[PDB]
């Protein structure tokens, strides 16, 4: 994961 998730918004 991250905090945002694998599926989330790019850093």
């Amino acid at each position: 994961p991250g905090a945002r998730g694998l599926t989330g918004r790019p850093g």
Partner: antibody
Amino acid sequence: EVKLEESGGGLVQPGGSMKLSCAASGFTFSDAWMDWVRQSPEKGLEWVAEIRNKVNNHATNYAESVKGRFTISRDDSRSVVYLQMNNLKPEDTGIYYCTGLTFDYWGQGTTLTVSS
Amino acid sequence: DIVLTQSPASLAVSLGQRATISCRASESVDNYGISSMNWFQQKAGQPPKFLIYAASKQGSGVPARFSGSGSGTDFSLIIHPVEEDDTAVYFCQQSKGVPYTFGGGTKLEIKR
């Protein structure tokens, strides 16, 4: 093991209110960004609302069709996300999924029927 | 809003064969060097299950027979070899920015 359980779905008359609740476990809740997504045969899958972690100031976002009506929030001490829905329309009918870590993990969902 | 348009609508593949499903976005989903395109499997009566992230990378526990490709506006999901349990609707989904949006879904039928 990740688990999300939604509750609080049911029947409501047009213009009424309802509060959905999402109990999450199996991951660091305070870090996760959480969302609500809904599904209907007419609209398909629509993202509804987002709430982010403490580091992003618990920032909320909403789909245009629910702004001013729906309010998302969270209790990090209890690992729960809420969705307060006001002024419900028939078009808000569908199955409402709670998702964690944006869309990595999904609950079984709860049904909302808006009708007279 | 970024609109995602899937093709084909449905599709029938024999066991052990390749299924290729496409997704065209109305604007680029590229941001900070990642193509923010995710794929989901929805089996009958179940919630969507997360398969692919960042166009081509595979989610934890997802079989190797699922894999995606693409960048910018054109993406696809490849399933090979197809098996009986892959009968499902597959959705593409974009996380480049708010509002997050989904494709309309594509139905994969297993031929027999």
